Ligand binder design. Sequence first.
Ligand SMILES: O=C(Nc1ccc(C(=O)N[C@@H]2c3cccc(O)c3C[C@@H]2C(=O)O)c(O)c1)NC1CC1
Length: 167
Amino acid sequence: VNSFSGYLKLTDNVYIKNADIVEEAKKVKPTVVVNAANVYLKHGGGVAGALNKATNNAMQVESDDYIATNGPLKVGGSCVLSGHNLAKHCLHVVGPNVNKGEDIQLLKSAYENFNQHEVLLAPLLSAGIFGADPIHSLRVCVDTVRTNVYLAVFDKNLYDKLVSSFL
Ligand SMILES: O=C(Nc1ccc(C(=O)N[C@@H]2c3cccc(O)c3C[C@@H]2C(=O)O)c(O)c1)NC1CC1
C-alpha cells in the first residue's frame, strides 16, 4: 500500500491521473519524482521549469554543480539528485526532444531508467514541449517500465484522450 490517490490503473504496474506533478509531489513526498530533463540540466520550461521553480531554484543550483563536475547527460540517460522539498530524490531523465531532431527510439532507453526505482511519480517522457506523441510515450512507458509508476498528466483533455485510446 502507498499514498498515491485517485489514479486509474492501466496495467499491473502503471497508474495515471490528471494532476499537476508539482502539486502531486508536494502532497505525497514520494521517494522519487522524475524530471523531464535535458542533457544540460537547464530547467527552463515544461515540467522541468515547474519543478525547479517549486524548489526556489535550488534544483538548478544543484544541477549546475553536477554538470560542472560530470559534464552533460546522454539523451536516454539519467542522474539521481536531491528531491529538495518535493521528494527524497529527483531522477532527472532525458527523453529525446523531437524539436531537436533526436531519435524517438531513444524513448525506450529513457524509460528503462525508471526500472532502477521501485516506485516513482513521473510525467510522460518526451511529451509536452519535447514534441513527441504522448499516446506513443504512454505505450512505450507501459511496455518498458516494470516498476510501479504513477504518471501525472497536466492537461485534462490529453488525460481523457490517453485513457480512452489505451489498448
Ligand atoms: O507549473 C506548474 N506545473 C506544471 C506541470 C506540468 C507542466 C508541463 O509542461 N507538462 C507537460 C505538458 C503540457 C501539455 C501537454 C503535454 O503533453 C505535456 C507533457 C507534460 C506533462 O503534462 O507531463 C508545466 O508546464 C507546469 N505548477 C505550478 C502551479 C504550481
